Design an enzyme around this catalytic site. Structure first.
Site, PDB file in Angstrom:
ATOM      1  N   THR F  90       2.713   7.356  -5.364  1.00 10.66           N
ATOM      2  CA  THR F  90       4.057   7.062  -5.843  1.00 10.66           C
ATOM      3  C   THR F  90       4.790   6.059  -4.967  1.00 10.66           C
ATOM      4  OG1 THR F  90       4.957   8.940  -4.626  1.00 10.66           O
ATOM      5  CG2 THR F  90       4.194   9.329  -6.858  1.00 10.66           C
ATOM      6  N   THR F  91       4.350   5.860  -3.729  1.00  9.96           N
ATOM      7  CA  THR F  91       4.925   4.826  -2.885  1.00  9.96           C
ATOM      8  C   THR F  91       4.003   3.640  -2.680  1.00  9.96           C
ATOM      9  OG1 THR F  91       4.753   4.573  -0.482  1.00  9.96           O
ATOM     10  CG2 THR F  91       4.822   6.806  -1.361  1.00  9.96           C
ATOM     11  N   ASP F 388       0.537  17.596  -5.162  1.00  8.00           N
ATOM     12  CA  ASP F 388      -0.245  16.383  -4.925  1.00  8.00           C
ATOM     13  C   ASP F 388      -1.729  16.709  -4.797  1.00  8.00           C
ATOM     14  OD1 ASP F 388       1.909  14.650  -5.058  1.00  8.00           O
ATOM     15  OD2 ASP F 388       2.295  14.701  -2.901  1.00  8.00           O
TER      16      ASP F 388
HETATM   17  N1  LIG Z   1      -5.967   9.097   8.388  1.00  8.86           N
HETATM   18  C1  LIG Z   1      -5.754   7.953   7.695  1.00  8.86           C
HETATM   19  N2  LIG Z   1      -5.971   6.748   8.259  1.00  8.86           N
HETATM   20  C2  LIG Z   1      -5.766   5.607   7.580  1.00  8.86           C
HETATM   21  N3  LIG Z   1      -5.334   5.556   6.313  1.00  8.86           N
HETATM   22  C3  LIG Z   1      -5.081   6.689   5.628  1.00  8.86           C
HETATM   23  C4  LIG Z   1      -5.278   7.980   6.294  1.00  8.86           C
HETATM   24  N4  LIG Z   1      -4.954   8.922   5.392  1.00  8.86           N
HETATM   25  C5  LIG Z   1      -4.581   8.286   4.252  1.00  8.86           C
HETATM   26  N5  LIG Z   1      -4.654   6.954   4.399  1.00  8.86           N
HETATM   27  C6  LIG Z   1      -4.329   5.927   3.382  1.00  8.86           C
HETATM   28  O1  LIG Z   1      -2.925   5.890   3.142  1.00  8.86           O
HETATM   29  C7  LIG Z   1      -2.699   5.525   1.784  1.00  8.86           C
HETATM   30  C8  LIG Z   1      -1.453   6.213   1.259  1.00  8.86           C
HETATM   31  O2  LIG Z   1      -1.369   7.555   1.731  1.00  8.86           O
HETATM   32  P1  LIG Z   1      -0.259   8.526   1.097  1.00  8.86           P
HETATM   33  O3  LIG Z   1       1.033   8.384   1.861  1.00  8.86           O
HETATM   34  O4  LIG Z   1      -0.857   9.893   0.879  1.00  8.86           O
HETATM   35  O5  LIG Z   1      -0.064   7.838  -0.338  1.00  8.86           O
HETATM   36  P2  LIG Z   1       1.355   7.198  -0.706  1.00  8.86           P
HETATM   37  O6  LIG Z   1       1.547   6.082   0.296  1.00  8.86           O
HETATM   38  O7  LIG Z   1       1.178   6.735  -2.125  1.00  8.86           O
HETATM   39  O8  LIG Z   1       2.285   8.368  -0.528  1.00  8.86           O
HETATM   40  C9  LIG Z   1      -3.937   5.939   1.010  1.00  8.86           C
HETATM   41  O9  LIG Z   1      -4.366   4.857   0.181  1.00  8.86           O
HETATM   42  C10 LIG Z   1      -4.993   6.226   2.054  1.00  8.86           C
HETATM   43  O10 LIG Z   1      -6.086   5.334   1.861  1.00  8.86           O
END
Ligand SMILES: Nc1ncnc2c1ncn2[C@@H]1O[C@H](COP(=O)(O)OP(=O)(O)O)[C@@H](O)[C@H]1O
Ligand SMILES: Nc1ncnc2c1ncn2[C@@H]1O[C@H](COP(=O)(O)OP(=O)(O)O)[C@@H](O)[C@H]1O
Ligand SMILES: Nc1ncnc2c1ncn2[C@@H]1O[C@H](COP(=O)(O)OP(=O)(O)O)[C@@H](O)[C@H]1O
Ligand SMILES: [Mg+2]
Ligand SMILES: [Mg+2]
Ligand SMILES: [Mg+2]
Ligand SMILES: [Mg+2]
Lengths: 535, 385, 106, 49, 307, 523
Positions: F90-91, F388
């Protein structure tokens, strides 16, 4: 002021004529920027934050709050064009306003408005005749790619423009699916029977054409099944609820022993109706009315799919498409209550499908007729609504192309040809009506001019080249194929639009011209205005 | 004048004058006001000269009588068989109106309509309520139509039955719904059997009604509008549709005499009297669509087309439609004037100019103080040209 | 700021502001409730808008009766309410430990 | 809990109608946007055309 | 003669109620203290169904006053005739509860119903024969929506054989008065249709128009009280579901208008799911809104059955 | 005043409108730019109802903020769309749309036409889809460890990351239990049949998913049992009270015995209903409507435990869990409609409230996730994170394709688009390559929120992704270093990333098509 005692304001003469022209020009300048493949959409905020994105001139002028009557006239003109044709709602307004402009210029030069009106009427008649005689192409000679090209032409300038390659296929398949022939053996294409649903989510390319029908409804109980394969469908126009005696009927008990049986009968009546319906094999039951929980439980135990508060038009379409008979009552000519299996409809599947966060019902492969529904999928409700409007325009256009098998080229080809022909034809009709007809011709050029302006091109040069081509076509019998030349707004160069595939239904231009001429005539007939002070 | 809320008493009186002219002739409502204003503008200088208002009035009456003589002398007789003369009168009446490029279309219609609602040999007048005008948005004024049969804006209640050929039509002033006495009535249920009995007897009543209707051969059913009771119950509509009968309800209690005059039907208020002799035979009854701009029920063809016609007025705007209706009314009223008085006069200000001239002569012959007033009358009538 | 360009009448506390606000409110609650703790604590009197009197030494009661409109204070009041609903005791100590954790982290 | 209070320190000590911007977002980017708007106000006058 | 207990919830309810309990008190001679400073014996003839005489000839009213925010009941105490009421019939919480139906009908002010119910029992016990209850509240607005329906509910569970005569302030059509009013009113009507026996729809818009006609916020609570007494100072509800009324001078089907309006604004907001996260995140399932909507189309069709 | 349009109708047009829309969009983006990745920080939102929302969820934030610019409205709407469709990203979607509009602003200032930019964007979107589908990998959904890693890779960026194993197991169990098939139609409805009940207090580590359901209810009568070890359950939509008839059933009494006879008839009706129920020999009876005290008497005499007024949704979940079928006429009750499958009915006091458990079911197609924690706000955030997680599990079980995270997918697609752009010779190659470089914002944002050097790291990463088999290389959101996703374990659902890219590109297309704002006019 003092002699005439009317309690209001009074405009008279060149003042009110210029005012009317100003109003019409205002309305046309609102929409000029939304014309052609290079036109852009508009936001509209409804004084509460309600947003509407659109390119549809009729939609824009409906949403606007117009105060001047000479501009309300053009708003109704766009509405009427949308009702009778479904496309051209912007071009008709632009042309009406330009006709008004030039006609007021003539009236300022002191050509009498009656003479301007006669000249406009003559030019309208002769333009219609010249179109019908020289500028039409037979869709029989062109095949199905003609329909696809007309759909893509209509979708250009919309948010389903570039995706036209696929949306045109969808539109054509849908119109051919809802094609039906009636008594008199005339082929009829009843659009507004294609159902259009919107559901934000997957990309535009993920929009779906349903061979069958799509219902914006769901089953009445979560214990009911949500998929049925050999669906026997019962369309009912009455409610399935605990039966209450009507208004002029009262229960007055004087022997308590009857109360129990009366109360149980109030439910057993509906129970018996439901059992009669289910005895035929009906596993799908659509209802315009309501369904009590007592009844929904019967459907659940029978393994049927019941749907309540269905819409009358959706029900009529599902019935026509599946072979069912809408029943307002289970009553025959023998004074009894029965339900025959012949009154049932059929469908190869009925399913409740999960569209992003909602759910709807899909009736697939109905027999006794083919039907069509379209689920539009975009990024939000604004996008989805604009997609719905664009698709409605495209469906109406394809319908017109299939009904009348004549098309004309686009990109200002028709307007350029008419400008040439009418500036040559004016020489024969009177001396002042001649000027009026020349001004009609010149006004017609506002369409390619606007197309080029929106394309950010040299409108003067481009329209001059266009008129040169069409004059060559009308003076050299060996180059009559130049009629099909119009604007290519992606390159700023004239182009054979019949070979490029930029087609419009003849009815679009013809009705646009007639309606614009009538609007110009009515507004030009006004030489005074008395505005009474409200009370 | 009626639409601009004039406030001065004299202006109100001129409004009333224009309405009276619209009544008596239906054409000339602008000329009459201009003539009145001009006569008064001449009274201005007469009063200034110092003539008494009574003398001015009497001399104006004299000039009026002489002018009636002059106009009658100018006039020429006309036969209603002179269809070209009628067409020319209608075109003249329409030349002044927004519908003048369509005069070629609306003059023959305005002559046919009036010539269809009068016996041309005996008629001394015409009731233009026999001519129905139906304003429908959409199309253009070249789409105006003269329907010899009947046209109705009421919608058809059946789905699937829109067209009927060899149509037998019946007007129903009674209600096809559960029985209801004019007195306070109730149905007291005290046993469970009576509930089913009530439903069954209601079904049977309605079915007997629709069967008595079908038995006459009626396939088109016009039901009058009924407040205080349902004129067409859901059971009745179901049964009629199953019996393949087109049904049009919500007919208005003021259109009944018109519909009867048109399609020879006789209104039936009791099912017992609903028989075949109370029907109307029409070669076609169809629900026609107007390019998504609405629907119309057209009952065309009639074995008893009795002195009634309808005119469908089309147009691109509400304003132009209203003015088309008004202009067509002016044309019909011109034909009505010709029917009333079989006399014709030239236009283009010729009568006004002849009036000016001959009343100038009359004034020179009427030496006195009336001479000034008659000369004023003449120069006042010289204002229309 | 960003939110204030879209909603002009918007209130915002960012990065350091947010932390200062939260820690200040937590320490304020701690400063009020420090005196409730233990048998040698002091009884507070609480007067409603109608004039009704409450004599209390209870952390949850004191929280809910104090006249406060702070978001951090609401958060901590909710944590104390859950503590009280499930265990019945520990609300004052809860507030104190929260405030002192926030202070030692600041 | 329906009001965010001014943070302790400079935000509270600030005068009534005074404004304080800090950081790339509140200061640098807004300054660059303003200067860009200025350049846009005067861009259409540059040159013989 | 059987006794009628009168609950009043929410700002709107607590401010109709006081005015009613004043109009009638003056219609009976009771002063603010409670003393019967009256002469006629018809005032005492049927005074037992409203007042619960105590020792000392002080007629305490049979009225409960509820709101999640104390500041309204404080204004009622301080107001006029704010002292006849029992100092223990004032039941209030500390949380305002905003204008969320879920907040008032769920755990966010749910324990309070268990404080208003031990006052309904302590008020019915005094009644020799309890006729029933009269709850004055607001269909949609503040707590009156949520708390006014969790009260109809728990009082129809605890006393399921008594008349429940509601007086609800149906929302005015022109004035939205709130962004979540369509939701609160469909959710409350969905409970009142089942758990109520007769409902009087007091439209603020129509009441305001009547006040303007009389002239030729208090004025509305002073133009609703004379109607509440013309209803409760002395052949209806033929069908046990069309028990909604419009007072005047009426079991009219003009109610169908109000309901169509409410259900079309409900459907407008439900389509975009606007202001739904609060309800789901505070204790509703997204299907209670579909049920509410269905049941309001039900009501509208039951009322459309006549004309 | 002789106007043509009503006063208050203001019409803006042109590059001012375009730049305004683009600035509003990128402002919406800048609002939540820092809420992306594992090292994000919480935001405390103040509801209009005096509430508080402490979250990291882009859609939560954008749903709680209010705006007046229609472009910002559209961005909030596309965030809602992404959340409703996939329940994650969503972000990421908001940030991508903001960056796409930002890079399109360039070409718009340089006289390029918005339709040209839009066609280029659509080409690029198609090629993004192709590249994602090429770099995706399959999943064996039978591998509970693989699914648990996917769910960890989806919740690691949220507050529950501290209880990652617990939340992953909860979400996996809930979705695998809600997985249901009937008539050849698979359906994972985790909104009607996976219920989250937040009971403040306790500790989060005791939160669990029940093999059954839970409701906030007590027995109607304290003589009823509160513990049943193999309950046969009956569900009803009808009231076990004596209610009135639908008609005007008015009675008329003239005889003496008739009044008492009528009251006794009511009692006998209740007796007959309760006998129709007892005939099935149940142990528990659960109603959506009331239960009269006489009915309670008869049921207790039959040794039956009753629960009075349950919600329709809770009743449907009880049906799915215990294997029962809701009825509305106890006369129409059948053994197939009785609920066998529940292994234990318990009614225990949690705090000062009575909760009814129908747990220990076998093959329960519905569940209740019992969340316990410090406060309603903490538990609301935990519930959102679990939503989620469950939505991600569902998306996987539907489409078993995975793509690498940490921005690895974004960089792979950007590289593929730059490579494909070299064959383009028209004028759209520039906006095409521009959206390609606009995809880099995801790893850029990750680096910014971890606190590392964006310039250096993004350069090293763009360089790594120019080698051959390096499309899995991404960044750590916890240390600010480049890693292989095959070694880190952050793998997103292909469906999630597809929906993200599609929604972003279409939002950009919409706002680019938009011009000529109009306002004021009243509906
Ligand atoms: N430990 C991590 N290290 C690096 N990147 C990550 C990690 N965990 C998640 N991500 C990346 O961060 C992106 C967004 O994470 P998240 O905040 O859950 O989604 P959104 O930004 O849509 O809320 C995902 O595409 C994922 O690939
Ligand atoms: N591909 C194209 N190339 C050139 N001109 C086009 C093309 N498609 C449509 N047009 C022109 O655009 C005009 C109408 O554009 P638009 O505003 O979208 O339709 P409407 O007139 O129905 O509002 C038509 O006159 C047609 O000639
Ligand atoms: N074609 C024409 N040529 C000359 N005069 C005409 C023509 N048509 C109408 N007129 C004149 O115009 C007058 C009618 O104008 P009109 O606007 O109808 O006024 P009114 O409503 O008073 O009849 C008549 O006196 C007639 O002589
Ligand atoms: Mg078009
Ligand atoms: Mg005339
Ligand atoms: Mg302690
Ligand atoms: Mg995520």
């Amino acid at each position: 002021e003092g002699p005439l005692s009317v309690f209001g304001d009074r405009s008279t003469g060149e003042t009110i004529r210029s005012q009317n022209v100003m109003a019409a020009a205002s309305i046309a300048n609102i929409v000029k920027s939304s014309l052609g493949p290079v036109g852009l959409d508009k936001m509209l905020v409804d004084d509460i934050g309600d947003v509407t994105i659109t390119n549809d001139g009729a939609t824009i002028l409906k949403l606007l709050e117009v105060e001047h009557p000479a501009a309300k006239v053009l708003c109704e003109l766009a509405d009427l064009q949308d009702k009778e044709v479904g496309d051209g709602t912007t071009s008709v307004v632009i042309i009406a306003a330009e006709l008004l402009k030039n006609a007021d210029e003539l009236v300022k030069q002191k050509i009498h408005p009656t003479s301007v009106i006669s000249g406009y009427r003559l030019a309208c008649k002769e333009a219609v005749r010249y179109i019908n005689e020289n500028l039409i192409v037979n869709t029989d000679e062109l095949g199905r790619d003609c329909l696809i090209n007309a759909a893509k032409t209509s979708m250009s300038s919309k948010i389903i423009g570039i995706n036209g390659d696929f949306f045109a296929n969808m539109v054509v398949d849908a119109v051919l699916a809802i094609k039906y022939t009636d008594i008199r053996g005339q082929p009829r294409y009843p659009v507004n029977s294609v159902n259009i649903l919107k559901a934000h989510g997957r990309s535009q390319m993920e929009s779906m054409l349903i061979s069958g029908y799509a219902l914006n409804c769901v089953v009445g109980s979560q214990g009911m099944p949500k998929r049925i394969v050999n669906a026997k469908i019962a369309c009912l126009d009455f409610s399935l609820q605990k039966t209450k005696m009507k208004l002029g009927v009262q229960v007055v008990i004087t022997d308590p022993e009857k109360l129990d049986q009366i109360r149980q009968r109030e439910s057993d009546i509906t129970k018996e109706r439901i059992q009669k319906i289910l005895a035929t094999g009906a596993n799908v039951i659509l209802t315009t009315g309501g369904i009590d929980d007592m009844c929904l439980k019967y459907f659940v135990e029978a393994g049927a799919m019941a749907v309540r508060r269905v819409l009358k038009r959706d029900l009529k379409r599902i019935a026509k498409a599946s072979g069912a008979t809408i029943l307002s009552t289970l009553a025959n000519l023998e004074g009894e209550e029965t339900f025959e299996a012949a009154m049932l409809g059929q469908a190869e599947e009925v399913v409740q499908e999960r569209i992003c966060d909602d759910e709807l019902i899909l009736i697939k492969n109905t027999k006794a007729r083919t039907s069509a529904s379209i689920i539009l999928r975009g990024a939000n409700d604004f996008m989805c609504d604009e997609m719905e409007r664009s698709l409605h325009d495209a469906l109406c256009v394809v319908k017109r192309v299939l009904e009348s098998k004549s098309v004309v080229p686009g990109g200002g080809a028709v307007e350029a040809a008419l400008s040439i022909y009418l500036e040559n034809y004016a020489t024969s009709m009177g001396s002042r009506e001649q000027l009026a007809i020349a001004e009609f011709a010149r006004s017609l050029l506002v369409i390619p001019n606007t197309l080029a302006v929106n394309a950010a091109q040299d409108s003067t040069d481009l329209v001059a080249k266009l008129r040169a081509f069409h004059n060559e076509a009308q003076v050299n019998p060996e180059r009559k194929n130049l009629k099909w030349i119009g604007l290519d707004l992606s390159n700023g160069k004239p182009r054979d639009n019949k070979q490029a595939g930029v087609f419009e239904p003849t009815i679009v231009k013809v009705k646009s011209l007639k309606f614009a001429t009538e609007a110009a005539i009515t507004i030009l007939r006004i030489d005074d205005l008395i505005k009474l002070h409200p009370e | 004048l009626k639409q601009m809320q004039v406030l001065h008493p004299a202006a109100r009186m001129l409004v009333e004058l224009s309405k009276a002219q619209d009544i008596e002739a239906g054409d000339g409502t602008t000329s009459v006001v201009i003539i009145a204003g001009s006569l008064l503008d001449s009274c201005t200088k007469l009063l200034q000269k110092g003539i008494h208002p009574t003398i001015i009035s009497e001399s104006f009456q004299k000039a009026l009588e002489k002018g009636i003589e002059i106009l009658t002398d100018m006039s020429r007789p006309v036969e209603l068989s002179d269809r070209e003369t009628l067409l020319n009168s209608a075109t003249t009446s329409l030349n002044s109106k927004v519908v003048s490029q369509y005069s070629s279309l609306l003059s023959p219609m305005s002559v046919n309509a009036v010539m269809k609602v009068i016996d041309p040999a005996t008629a001394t007048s015409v009731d233009l309520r026999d001519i129905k005008i139906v304003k429908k948005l959409g199309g253009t004024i070249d789409d105006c139509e003269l329907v010899e049969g009947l046209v109705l804006t009421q919608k058809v209640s059946n789905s699937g039955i829109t067209r009927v050929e060899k149509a037998k039509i019946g007007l129903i002033q009674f209600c096809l719904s559960a029985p209801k006495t004019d007195m306070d009535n109730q149905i007291v249920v005290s046993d469970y059997a009576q509930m089913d009995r009530v439903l069954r007897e209601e079904r049977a009543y309605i079915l007997n009604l629709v069967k008595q209707i079908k038995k006459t051969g009626c396939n088109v059913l016009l039901i009058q509008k009924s407040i205080l009771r349902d004129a067409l119950s859901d059971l009745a509509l179901h049964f009629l549709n199953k019996m393949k009968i087109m049904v049009i309800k919500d007919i208005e209690r003021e259109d009944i005499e018109f519909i009867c005059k048109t399609i020879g039907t006789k209104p039936v208020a009791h099912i017992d009297q609903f028989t075949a002799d109370m029907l109307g035979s029409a070669e076609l009854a169809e629900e026609v669509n107007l390019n998504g701009s609405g629907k119309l029920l057209k009952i065309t063809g009639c074995a008893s087309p009795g002195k009634t016609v309808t005119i469908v007025v089309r147009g691109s705007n509400k304003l132009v439609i209203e003015e088309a209706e008004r202009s067509i009314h002016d044309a019909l009223c011109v034909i009505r004037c010709l029917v009333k008085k079989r006399a014709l006069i030239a236009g283009g200000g010729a009568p006004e100019i002849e009036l000016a001239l001959r009343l100038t002569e009359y004034s020179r012959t009427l030496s006195g103080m009336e001479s000034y007033c008659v000369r004023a009358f003449a120069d006042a009538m010289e204002v229309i040209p | 700021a960003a939110v204030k360009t879209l909603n002009p009448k918007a209130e915002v506390a960012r990065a350091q502001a947010a932390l200062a606000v939260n820690i200040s409110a937590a320490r304020g609650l701690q400063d009020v409730l420090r005196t409730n703790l233990g048998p040698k604590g002091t009884m507070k009197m609480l007067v409603s808008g109608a004039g009704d009197i409450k004599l209390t030494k209870d952390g949850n009661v004191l929280l809910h009766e104090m006249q406060i409109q702070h978001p951090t204070a609401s958060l901590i009041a909710k944590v104390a309410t859950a503590q009280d609903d499930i265990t019945g005791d520990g609300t004052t100590s809860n507030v104190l430990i929260i405030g002192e954790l926030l202070k030692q982290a600041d | 809990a329906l009001h965010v209070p001014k943070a302790p320190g400079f935000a509270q000590m600030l005068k009534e109608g005074a404004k304080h911007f800090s950081g790339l977002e509140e200061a640098v980017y807004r300054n660059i946007q303003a200067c860009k708007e200025l350049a846009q106000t005067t861009r259409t006058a540059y040159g013989p055309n | 003669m059987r006794e009628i207990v009168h609950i009043q919830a929410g700002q709107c309810g607590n401010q109709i109620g006081a005015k009613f309990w004043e109009v009638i008190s003056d219609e009976h001679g009771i002063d603010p203290t409670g003393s019967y400073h009256g002469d006629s014996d018809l005032q005492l003839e049927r005074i037992n169904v409203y007042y619960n005489e105590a020792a000392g000839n002080k007629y305490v009213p049979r009225a409960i006053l509820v709101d999640l925010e104390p500041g309204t009941m404080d204004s009622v105490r301080s107001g006029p005739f704010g002292q006849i009421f029992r100092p223990d019939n004032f039941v209030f919480g500390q949380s305002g509860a905003g204008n969320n139906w879920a907040k008032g009908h769920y755990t966010e002010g749910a324990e309070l119903v268990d404080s208003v119910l031990d006052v309904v029992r302590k008020e019915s016990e005094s009644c020799d024969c309890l006729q029933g209850f009269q709850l004055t509240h607001s269909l949609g607005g503040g707590t009156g929506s949520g708390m006014g329906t969790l009260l109809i509910s728990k009082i129809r569970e605890e006393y399921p054989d008594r008349i429940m005569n509601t007086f609800s302030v149906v929302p005015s059509p022109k004035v939205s008065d709130t962004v979540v009013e369509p939701y609160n009113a469909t959710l409350s009507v969905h409970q009142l249709v089942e758990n109520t026996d007769e409902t009087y729809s007091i439209d603020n818009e129509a009441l305001y128009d009547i006040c303007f006609r009389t002239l030729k916020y208090g004025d509305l609570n002073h133009l609703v009280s004379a109607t509440m007494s013309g209803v409760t100072t002395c052949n209806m509800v033929p069908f046990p579901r069309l028990h909604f009324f419009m007072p005047g001078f009426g079991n009219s089907t003009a109610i169908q208008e109000l309901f169509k309006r409410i259900s079309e604004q409900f459907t407008a907001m439900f389509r975009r799911k606007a202001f739904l996260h609060w309800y789901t995140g505070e204790g509703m399932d997204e299907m209670e809104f579909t049920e509410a909507e269905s049941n309001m189309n039900d009501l509208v069709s039951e009322y459309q059955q006549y004309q | 005043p002789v106007l043509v349009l009503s006063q208050n109708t203001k019409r803006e047009s042109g590059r001012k409108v375009q730049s305004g829309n683009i600035n509003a969009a990128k402002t919406i983006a800048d609002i939540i730019r820092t809420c992306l990745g594992p090292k994000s920080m919480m935001k405390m939102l103040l509801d209009p109802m005096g509430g508080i929302v402490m979250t990291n969820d882009g859609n939560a934030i954008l749903r709680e903020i209010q705006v007046q610019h229609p472009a910002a409205k559209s961005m909030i709407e596309i965030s809602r769309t992404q959340d409703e469709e996939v329940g994650d990203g969503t972000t990421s979607v908001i940030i991508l749309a903001g960056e796409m509009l930002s890079v399109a602003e360039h070409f718009l200032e340089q006289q390029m036409h918005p339709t040209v930019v839009i066609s280029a964007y659509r080409k690029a979107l198609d090629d993004m889809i192709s590249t994602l589908k090429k770099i995706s990998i399959p999943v064996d959904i039978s591998d509970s460890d693989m699914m648990l890693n996917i769910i960890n890779s989806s919740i690691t960026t949220k507050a529950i990351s501290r209880w990652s194993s617990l939340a992953c197991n909860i979400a996996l169990d809930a979705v695998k239990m809600v997985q249901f098939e009937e008539n050849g139609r698979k359906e994972i409805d985790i909104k009607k049949y996976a219920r989250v009940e937040k009971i403040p207090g306790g500790i989060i580590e005791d939160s669990c998913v029940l093999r059954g359901v839970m409701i906030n209810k007590d027995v109607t009568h304290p003589r009823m049992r509160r513990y049943i070890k193999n309950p046969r359950i009956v569900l009803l939509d009808s009231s076990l009270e004596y209610k009135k008839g639908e008609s005007q059933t008015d009675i008329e009494i003239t005889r003496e015995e008739d009044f008492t006879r009528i009251l006794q008839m009511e009692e006998e009706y209740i007796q007959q209903l309760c006998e129709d129920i007892i005939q099935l020999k149940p142990d528990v009876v659960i109603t959506e409507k009331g239960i009269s005290d006489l009915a309670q008497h008869y049921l207790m005499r039959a040794n039956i435990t009753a629960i009075r007024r349950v919600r329709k949704t809770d009743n449907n979940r009880i049906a799915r869990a215990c294997g029962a079928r809701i009825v509305s006429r106890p006369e129409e009750l059948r053994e197939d409609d009785v609920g066998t499958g529940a292994g234990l009915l318990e009614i225990k006091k949690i705090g000062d409230e009575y909760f009814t458990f129908i747990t220990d079911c076998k093959d329960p197609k519905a569940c209740t996730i019992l969340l316990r924690g410090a406060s309603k706000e903490i538990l609301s955030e935990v519930e959102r994170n679990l939503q989620d997680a469950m939505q991600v599990c569902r998306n996987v079980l539907l489409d078993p394709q995975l793509v690498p995270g940490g921005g690895a997918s974004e960089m792979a697609v950007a590289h593929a688009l730059t490579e494909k752009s070299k064959a383009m010779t028209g004028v759209e190659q520039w906006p095409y390559r521009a959206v390609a470089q606009a995809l880099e914002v995801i790893p850029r944002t990750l680096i910014q929120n971890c606190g590392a050097s964006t310039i250096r790291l993004l350069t090293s990463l763009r360089a790594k992704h120019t080698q051959e088999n390096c499309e899995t290389w991404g960044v750590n959101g916890e240390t600010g270093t480049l890693v292989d996703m095959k070694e880190l374990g952050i793998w997103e659902p292909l469906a999630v990333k597809l929906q993200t890219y599609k929604t972003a590109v279409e939002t950009a297309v919409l706002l680019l098509r938009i011009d000529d704002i109009v306002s004021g006019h009243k509906k």
